[PDB]
Amino acid sequence: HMVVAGIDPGITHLGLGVVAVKGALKARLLHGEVVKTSPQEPAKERVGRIHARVLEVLHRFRPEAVAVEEQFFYRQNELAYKVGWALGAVLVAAFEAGVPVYAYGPMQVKQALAGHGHAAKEEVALMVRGILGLKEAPRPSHLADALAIALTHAFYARMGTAKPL
Amino acid sequence: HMVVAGIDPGITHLGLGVVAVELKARLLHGEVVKTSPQEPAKERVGRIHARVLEVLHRFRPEAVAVEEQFFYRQNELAYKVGWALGAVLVAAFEAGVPVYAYGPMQVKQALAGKEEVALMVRGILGLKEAPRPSHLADALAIALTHAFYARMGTAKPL
DNA sequence: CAATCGGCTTTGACCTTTGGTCAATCGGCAGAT
DNA sequence: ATCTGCCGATTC
DNA sequence: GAAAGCCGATTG
Ligand SMILES: [Cl-]
Ligand code: NA
């Protein structure tokens, strides 16, 4: 039985999910959340709330690990910058919590969750509803990913191949 | 007396300087924060946030000004600079100081018609030698660049 | 309010009836004072 | 220790 | 040659 938080990082919508797992991938959704900020706030405050929110959730659920998604490529560099900001407030927060951080990328999730190298966006989210025993598929997109990441971290942790940051 | 913190953001060397102002001004504190890839990323960003926060509590500045490049020939770079930036803003948020951002264009041309500016800061403050490392002179350019535009009401908040 | 949508994907200086080129970023590592 | 240097830039 | 996320503006 282990508690993983999963984060799909981004400055506009930040996916936040806590789950709980030992035999096959069977886990139970503890918390789900999407942090939203608008380009109307001073950046200090957009990333200021991101940090507060993750801290509350890390204190409340005392997980064993944070897992974040890491995109292998951003089309323009101001995207990578700002997604970078939000990972910063996350990193600071996991440091204040002493929770250790692991990052996986968009193909390690596919390889773990659907068992295939290239699953469909529909092919993973179904594998998530199953690992979680959930009525409907979880929404929005960014929260679906966040839960996928948390489960992908648990998959590779069961094989002792986890990727710290 | 306008006291203004300047930052050259970066995950490996992060320039941090504080400056008070009366058409010129004096130096209050300087340091480069250093962190190494042998550290867990949570600890590198950790220290950067811890250390910026302390400076802001001490000197209670009226503005943090950070530099902001627009070119990065690779994404992995702009990503990690963002980490270190993010740690800053989290701290600026806690400290409650407003953040302002200037690009190298409005720093070069806010002070000198390349190295022509990096020497001017030795003057606009008053120093035997120009400052080292590079990253600290950058940090100090920025704090001045802000206070300059702060007097022309074209301060650009982030 | 809260969600859905489509467009955008570095910027600037220089010279080269005319749109061409070119350069800047910084993080990891290795080796020396 | 603290600095100076050169090299390399997305993955399937 | 594909890959994603930010922003600004539009609805119900
Ligand atoms: Cl979303
Ligand atoms: Na601000």
Residue numbers in the entry:
A (entry chain B): 0 to 20, 23 to 166
B (entry chain A): 0 to 21, 26 to 116, 122 to 166
Study text:
Holliday junctions (HJs) are DNA structures in which two duplexes are joined by the exchange of strands. The removal of HJs can occur through actions of specialized nucleases, termed resolvases. It belongs to the retroviral integrase superfamily that has a characteristic RNase H fold and catalytic mechanism that involves two divalent metal ions.
To obtain more detailed insights into substrate recognition by the enzyme, we performed  new X-ray diffraction experiments that are described in the Methods section and resulted in better resolution of 3.4 Å. Many of the side chains from the wedge directly stack with DNA base pairs that are closest to the junction point. Specifically, they buckle the base pairs by 17.1, 8.9, 34.9, and 33.8 degrees for DNA arms A1, A2, B1, and B2, respectively (A1 and A2 are the cleaved arms). Further analysis of the new 3.4 Å structure also indicated that the RuvC–HJ complex did not adopt a fully catalytic configuration. Namely, the distance between the phosphorus atoms of the scissile phosphates and C-α atoms of the catalytic Asp7 residues was greater than 8 Å, whereas in the structures of related retroviral integrase superfamily enzymes, it is within the range of 7.25–7.5 Å (PDB ID: 1ZBI20, 3O3G21, and 4E7I22). This implies that structural rearrangement of the complex must occur to achieve the catalytically active configuration. In the new RuvC–HJ X-ray structure, the DNA sequence that is located near the active sites only partially matched the cleavage consensus, and the complex did not correspond to the catalytic configuration. At the same time, the scissile phosphates were positioned too far from the active sites for catalysis to occur, suggesting that tension that is introduced at the exchange point of the HJ substrate displaced scissile phosphates from the active sites.
